[PDB]
Structure 1
Amino acid sequence: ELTQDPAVSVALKQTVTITCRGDSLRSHYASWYQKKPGQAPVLLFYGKNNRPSGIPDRFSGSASGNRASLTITGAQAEDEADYYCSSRDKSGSRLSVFGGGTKLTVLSQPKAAPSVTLFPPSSEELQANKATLVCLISDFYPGAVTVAWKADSSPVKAGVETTTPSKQSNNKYAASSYLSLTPEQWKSHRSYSCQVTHEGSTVEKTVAP
């Protein structure tokens, strides 16, 4: 009912506008919330030009037509978060809804390519009639990767579990992807590959029985 772009990135001290769209906004105000992992959401803006005290002046809102926008003029590193619009779900209704949410990435580090390590199934695991390949990804920035698995240059579309990237101590990111396989498939193919794509550049590691 309320739709926002899932992801946007801004450079430090630059200006970014996060927009919420929906039919209810033609007649209803929207409120705006900042959400960081492990912390309660924070009200940033509501109604017609209302900013709670304690919210820095770089946050401001606007509205026209069927859209509502939150603008950050001069993004800071601490502004990296998820941002949600909220409004009535429709006219004549007592219910409220949140938009899908926008993950704002504030580019606070130089771009860094991921280091990828791929491990084959253990001999002990195979003796247990199981096989898993472990694709470990570390030291990349920003924190977004796409992982693709290939079975002899053929895409594998089952048995893949991938983490969302999590911040390392050195402010780069790490992630992991696991491919579950029967021992038969692991020996039915000559090689298996983990393809990590980051910022348009692909890093591939390969293992074989």
Structure 2
Amino acid sequence: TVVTQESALTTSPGETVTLTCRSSAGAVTTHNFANWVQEKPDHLFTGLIGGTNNRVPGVPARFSGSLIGDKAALTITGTQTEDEAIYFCALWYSNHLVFGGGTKLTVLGQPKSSPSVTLFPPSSEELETNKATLVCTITDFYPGVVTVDWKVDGTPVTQGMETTQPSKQSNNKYMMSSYLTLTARAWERHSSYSCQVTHEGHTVEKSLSR
């Protein structure tokens, strides 16, 4: 029923990384015919492994499939920068296939860059409609894992915000956007607004006051 993979793994090019694929229904065996699929930006999926350990022709030799203990494995050796991607495993159970949740593989192929953060206040035109949307643009960060917190008069906001999943810029860095949508009442009931972007332990704050 539930196939589990590491949510995210980080490696550096040339190193060896191993993604695993575990099953709620017991040990993974060759009878589960583990498949590995790569997803690259623009919803581009390519089959990597089938039958646990068979490499699809055309896939670079550095990819291989195997079993490790009670789990199927995808191994990348001499990992290239282009291997930064999402990898789904899929296990076969007699009459249906179940995909894992996927592993976001980071291959450090660029120097660490901190996110450039811009906090825009609500526009005057939008306030006329009695809504107030603050827009936090987050650009030029690598690796592409960021967490975003919004503070209204110092309270962690937990609803009314939507944050984009990191998207690959042209410079191979990552970018993202976050919105905090308030009623005009909420906007005028409070005075301190801050968008906090956390990237690789350090946190960057942009803030404004009504």
**Structure 2 length-normalised TM:** 0.91
SS of match in other structure, 1:187: helix
What is the CA–CA distance in structure 1 between the aligned matches of 2:176 and 2:44, rounded to whole Å?
Answer: 25
* Superposition pairs of residues 120-135 of structure 1, within 5 angstroms: 120-135=121-136
* Structure 1 runs, 4 residues or longer, greater than 3 Å off: none
- Higher strand fraction: Structure 1 or Structure 2? 2
Match of 1:25 among 10, 28, 31: 28
Residue type at the aligned position of 2:42: G
CA distance in 1 between counterparts of 2:157 and 2:69 reads 45
Shift of 1:139: 1.2
CA distance in 2, matches of 1:33, 1:121: 42
CA–CA distance in 2 between the matches of 1:41 and 1:126? 43
Q: 1:134 to 1:24 in 2, by over 3 A?
A: same
Q: What amino acid is the match of 1:51? A: R
C-alpha deviation, 1:66, in angstroms:
2.2
The residue that corresponds to 1:169 in the other structure is 170
- Deviation, 1:53, is 2.5
Which consecutive unaligned segments of at least 5 residues does structure 1 have? none
The count of aligned residue pairs is 206
How big is the shift at 1:64?
4.0
Pair 1:86 & 2:87 matched? no
Between the aligned residues of both structures, percent identity stands at: 60
Match 2:73 to one of 69, 75, 87 = 69
DSSP-derived class of the 1:108 partner: coil
| Aligned residue number for residue 143 of structure 1 | 144
Amino acid of the structure 2 residue aligned with 1:137: I
**Contact 2:52 2:72 (C-alpha < 8 Å) held by counterparts:** no
| Amino acid aligned to 1:25 | V
Distance 1:176 1:129, change over 3 A: same
Q: Where does structure 2 lack aligned partners over 5 or more consecutive residues? A: none
What root-mean-square deviation, in Å, do the aligned CA atoms of Structure 1 and Structure 2 show?
Answer: 1.6
For residues 46 and 168 of structure 1, what CA distance do their matches in structure 2 show?
32
CA offsets per residue over residues 177-196 of structure 1, 9 Å max, x none? 11001111112122111011
Q: Which amino acid letter does the alignment assign opposite residue 76 of structure 2?
A: I
